[model samples]
Target: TPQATSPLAAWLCYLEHLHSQPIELGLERVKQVAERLDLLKPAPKIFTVAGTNGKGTTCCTLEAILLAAGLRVGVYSSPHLLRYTERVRIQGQELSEAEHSHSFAQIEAGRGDISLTYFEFGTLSALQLFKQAKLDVVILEVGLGGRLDATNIVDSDVAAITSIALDHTDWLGYDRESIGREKAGVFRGGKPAVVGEPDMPQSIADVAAELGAQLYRRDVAWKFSQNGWHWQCGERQLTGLPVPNVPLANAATALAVLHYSELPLSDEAIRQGLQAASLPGRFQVVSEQPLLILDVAHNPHAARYLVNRLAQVGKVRAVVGMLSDKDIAGTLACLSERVDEWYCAPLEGPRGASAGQLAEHLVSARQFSDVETAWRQAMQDADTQDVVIVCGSFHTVAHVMAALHL
Candidate 1:
């Protein structure tokens, strides 16, 4: 009782459970925990969003539309691009520090003798908190691969896969088919499963058939028509959704979620949600003059999306950097044509890519003292029609943003 809404409470529950780090794979432990907790709810609908790219944006869209319709929503996302608190939110507000601390304590008491990983603990705690908060809809973003992911413990009411690509080769496997099979794990028997990427791995379709899921596929099952600056879903056919400069394909995926969820929402609410939905470092335009743009495209698919998005804005002056672990070559290859000039910088962490590493892909016109400096110099060098884009990795973009306004 004394530990009702604090961050420490989560760790407390976890430690009380079993004191050692839990295994990060397989669903048995999670299933065991769920069974122990008696988490079987009559109408506990879950929407699991999984993909190599655009999962966050899809989650955001679902959350926004649901909230616009005045539904209470609970969301869990990963990697803490900015802070740990941003990972768990209710009705769009990050959990209060006190709330997280309190949930840790609750988890500690309830855990009793189960070793939980950081993610497992956080997820369990978030679920408990959501239970207490009595949310109407819960959106869980798959932290990593879906089959063995912590979020897969619960049954999903609807499952949406945004875009599957060739990243996380070590853990999720090397091919799209291998990864697709794993992600398609979130699909529940007889539930509606939505997949946006057209060329889905056969494994996804096979698994969906095996599970008796109603597959809502892009192009085949669902389609979108672009009108002017807006687009309309074949099912709903309503226009005026705000077109994001990032992945417009993600917007298409959002329509899949809406149609699959069957949740109540007015056209006004849908428009409001789409227009208001914003994911940072996603083709985020910080300025018009000299055209400063920021995007977190660490892999080839994401880079390809950024390239397409940039095409709408025309030619750009590139201010780029990356995390050392990303597909630097593939990323550079995607944007090589759109970028006019290159200003590469080293990111600021162990995994961050330095200017020298970036130079492996493209010949830089100039290198600055840092990412922000590179951004500024590029902006100054760019013409009114030339866009200054800082795109590569989240680390690269965040550092650039901080340096720019500072």
Candidate 2:
């Protein structure tokens, strides 16, 4: 419990210590506590997203479009770059520090002897705040695998899974099939289920079918026309759509999501929302002269997308730091040809990968003491025509984002 004036950081530290393990995936304890607090249904309309990559982008685009349609929406995502406040947003505005702390305090009072992990507590706090806001719609991105993730406690009105791949092998699975099954949990029976991964796993289709979901497969139910990239679902079409800051694939998934929603959105709202949507660290171009890009592409599935985005760029420099458990070599090899220079470094946590551990897999990479040192050197070596990408993990991109004051 917090003092009458305890700050947000103090509350966050308190939540982190409530459970022995940082991540306990079972949802029963969280679900039961949510029931006692009346936070199970935060909004009448719910959009839940699950995937290896594009999860945050899908939620952002959905939030953008829904807000443009003049409806109040709440978004809850994880691993905030600079501020704890980034995890919860109502109508695209983050709650004040007092508001977040107040919500956490409410949960502390209402939990009634149930212990929640740091993530589970935050998830409950986001939902509690959303409930108080009485949002028209709530967009939630699963923090981990969907079936057992804290966000899955809420039933989804519209569920989406994007780009199934092999990450979190220890907890989720070692193969795409195993991981895909875990992600398919967001789908609700007879509700709209959107599958955005082109090479989608058979397990996803199996689950969607078993649940009797209105399955909208990427190429089958909806797709972008080859010539103009106009989005289409059945006969309804959106032409001359502005390319979003988000990847087009995930943006397409967003189109299908809103298409199936009960919200009333015009084509103009989509165009305007797509043009307006921007997240700071997902391929964010922060500088013009050196062309610095920040991305949290920690897995090979995400790195492959970054490689495509980097295809038309000038001479490229990469500042990379990753978790020790990730497929560092496979993820980096996707950009092996695109990167002209490499500055590999270690992050500062239990899961962080050392510079030498990462450099061993590279053709040639300069190792630094830490993420900040690697980013500084890359910025120094960059010229007007060169592109510098700070990526490999959220820790890596967040470190650079802080230095750049973003």
Candidate 3:
């Protein structure tokens, strides 16, 4: 078989050339390609993050703080809520078309006779681009179960597990322990490991111990406390740090990383990083007139956070969309009561929940077929005090963002 290669074009080809429908667990194939491509040795310090809920916030927060510390940071996250370019960013900015073009060319030249998935190709391109850009730190967000995830190919300096929950049950498992162990795969012996979830599962502990990694669990090894308008992490705490919109969990996770890694972060750096750090499609507010809040709350865990955040905003109409495979019952149970009106859309692919499906699950009279038309009509009926929230799957937020920008 011939190795097929191209930049950005691999996404379309991924659907065509891949013989297997799913990826298997092994390092042999990737290692072979990496060796052929000369991609194994030192390039940049990497912190590969894996988890279900807080990975995005954790990755973005780290990116912001590293950028604040005068380090050039390249980040690769997944499920672009808006654009494909959202998957890769260097120095906290998404790659320009020219950067993508050149990086794609580099990957094409190097990837002789090796066919890679769209995600695998994109991740490789990001790493290749990072090498050329002279970055000090690179952050990779796992798109699936960590063990077999393409991002797992790189050796990491620090391994972080933000939060673990039962997601992708068919692929990973239906229980916390099963998911925890897979997310813990990034841990290498003796390296600093950051576990952000307060309730660290035993599987993670066992695996980290077996691997001989110096596991640092939050609320156990280190602690973070919050007082009126101030946050602190012990001994190494940046005193008087402001809380982030990413919630207490994510904020504490950031401080814990700074503490354990002994990163030179000041109080001002903490505040600026926490405040300015933004992960699009995660409770992002694009407009103010009707109090539009955009979030990528696809799962029940994430929806619960959005529900709590929405409670703070009082009551509002919500524009919701989700993938068909999500915990619809749990997700609706989390936020349906708080949402006075619902606008739903089917995601572009098979995983998306159609409007009728969402309406059936919610048992609500106020459901619309599409997000844009519903938003337009809802805005006409909304009062100045009424809030407009766009929340659901990443695809849902991406669709909404496209409409808004158009």
Candidate 4:
């Protein structure tokens, strides 16, 4: 019954083993603990984002734009690339290790007999931090399926399903329709639900209709013309929005969410936010000489975008490490045209796919036991003009980044 007075690392390890199962995706336990801690309703405004590929980028875009609008924003995202503290950000700054530990301790004190997963504990901690900070807005990025994701305990004022694709089939169902429906669960009745993808599955629409969510779908409620990329929503027209580093689809979705939130925003604020928004490990160009590209493109949908993005960089050498559960073959197939040579590495942890296992898919690809060695070899072998792409998963990108100290 003692408070968890451990450091962030210690608390993280403790939370990893706190629950019997890693991902028991129901909101009741989290909701109960949240109520006990008075974390169910944290901020005056909240946006919950869920999707396969664009959640992180969309959240970043939302946070950036809201902050530019002179709002103190708290954003909670998952699976940090470098540090655990990256999961919780207040006003564009990641929480310090001490702050994270303090929030974890508070969650520990609140949960009586409820067993929360590592993600659930982190979600609660983030809510606690936001509540304590009393920020103007809080953005919750769904760690998994929106229906039962730990972050779903809070009913968002605005919600978005950025893009739906086949992912987490074990937990979220096997097909995109099933996956779309699960992601759409974040939509609350009478509130705005922004669908980012132009080719939205009917299941998402069905869910929105069933829940009475005011669905502002891409191409229907809002439209964008590229070239200069002007956004038109209802009667308002915002021309000359800059092309963002993140996907414009997501940027547009964030814009829709902002527009529907009833908060006043200046045109300059929106423009500045879109231009300034950046998410690391999402097609990040770390270096130009011996060009290095880092992306956490583990799924087929993301890989497709990675392929298109890499098309501009020309054929390159790639270092890939992916999880065993991912559609590795499909992802590799998507990027096959862009990569001239492949170097495979084994990702650490239980979910990591072995390098040898990865090599089975590509007969000519070289395999290394670790990402550092593979990355070094890839860099050594690449020419100054040839790009070195580090991708597949966040772990892969982080591994390469730490090895290079970038």
Q: State each model's CA lDDT, in order.
A: 0.76, 0.87, 0.74, 0.87
C-alpha TM-scores of all predictions:
0.88, 0.96, 0.91, 0.95
Which pairs of residues collide in candidate 2? none
Residue 195 alpha-carbon offset, candidate 1, angstroms: 0.5
Task: Score candidate 3 by lDDT.
Answer: 0.74
- lDDT, candidate 1, 90-202, per-residue tens: 88988777777776666656656655666777777777778888788888899987988888887878998998997632453478788899899988887999998878889
The C-alpha stretches of model 4 lying farther than 4 A from their native spots are 1-4, 22-25, 168-173
Give the candidate order by descending lDDT: 2, 4, 1, 3
Q: Which residue segments of model 1 deviate by more than 4 Å?
A: 1-24, 35-43, 168-173, 227-236, 239-246, 380-384, 404-406
Worst 10 residues of 3 by lDDT: 1-10
Candidate 2 minimal-lDDT segment of 10 residues = 16-25
Q: 3 or 4: which has the higher TM-score?
A: 4
Whichever of 2 and 3 has more TM-score, that candidate is 2
Report the number of clashing residue pairs per model.
Answer: 21, 0, 2, 0
Please write out the lDDT profile of model 3 over residues 9-55, one tens digit for every residue. 45445434766455554655565666666655325578888888888
lDDT of 2 by residue, 172-270 (tens): 346888888889988999899999988888998888888788888899999885323688888988887888898889889999998887567887788
User: Candidate 4 overall Cα lDDT vs. reference?
Assistant: 0.87
RMSD of 4: 2.0
* Most TM-score-accurate candidate: 2
Task: List residue ranges in candidate 3 displaced over 4 A.
Answer: 1-17, 20-25, 168-173, 227-234
